[PDB]
Write a protein that binds this ligand. Sequence first.
Ligand code: NI
Length: 377
Amino acid sequence: KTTEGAFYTREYRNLFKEFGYSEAEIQERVKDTWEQLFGDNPKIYYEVGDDLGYLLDTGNLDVRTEGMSYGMMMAVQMDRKDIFDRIWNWTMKNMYMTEGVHAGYFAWSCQPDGTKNSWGPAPDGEEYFALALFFASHRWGDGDEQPFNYSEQARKLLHTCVHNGEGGPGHPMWNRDNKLIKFIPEVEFSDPSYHLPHFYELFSLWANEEDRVFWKEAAEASREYLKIACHPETGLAPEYAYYDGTPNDEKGYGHFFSGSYRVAANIGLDAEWFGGSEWSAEEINKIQAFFADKEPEDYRRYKIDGEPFEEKSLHPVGLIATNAMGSLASVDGPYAKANVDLFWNTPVRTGNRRYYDNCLYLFAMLALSGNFKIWFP
Ligand code: NI
């Protein structure tokens, strides 16, 4: 480690402020971003009745565990128990599976009416659900009424993630030998953007005790994995990658595209929470170096070696936001201020592809203003 993280100091860097933005403009911008996403201006969050709500993937017309778990994380960071509970309530009602091989997990995609489009889960959903739930327990207390017994729900979910398939036909979400998160439970490859060692550090404190060593090991395995998965010159990570670190392009996910964008963001947040490292600063410096001579209107899909496709980035605003959030891992970096300034000058996205960009956008607003916090017991 290179700095002491917010986990130890309990002080979160306001990078916007350190980079010269006013406290009042920062506060305004964070709130505006929240309101444009969750307020009643068509927006990614939709209230339903007195007790339900969801985040809608405006592009695919579905509700994803990625968005629901994001929404819960967002709501707890913002101290909005009412929104948290609406979303978690819908998730438990419509997504949680009690039948089939993936019982104990959440169906990754549902229609807006709650109908499951698949009984397969998406591990990046599970890990955000668990952490958001631990934060909710810590901010608000566990409810007496299920499923609002947050910390128990979190421990029980992480039990399944690690141990599924011991007493039967299910699959764990992490490989037990290499401690790496999987793309989906029935495969033996991974997805670099799913790797959240800063989350696993907290799981090592709060999960069932029987798994606390495993989670500390997973955190360390994830850090090592990211070293091999990001290209050594450009810093770009593939969307999917084998355990050996190389891209899995069997179905076209072996390049730098939408999934990959979260790698830079995850690295920035881990640096802020658990401390900088030389590897992380150098990695962000490489990503930002690669995009320094590129205009946002021209962002493409790239091979991880930097070779451009004709195809444009489908989510260039999300790319901007994650690259900016990555600056938390290289606050003195040569491109860190340009990236934060570019994000500052990029509005929240409109149109039917806005959901993914805007989730990344709010996470970056929170993190860069010192508002993406660890909530302790
Ligand atoms: Ni203002």
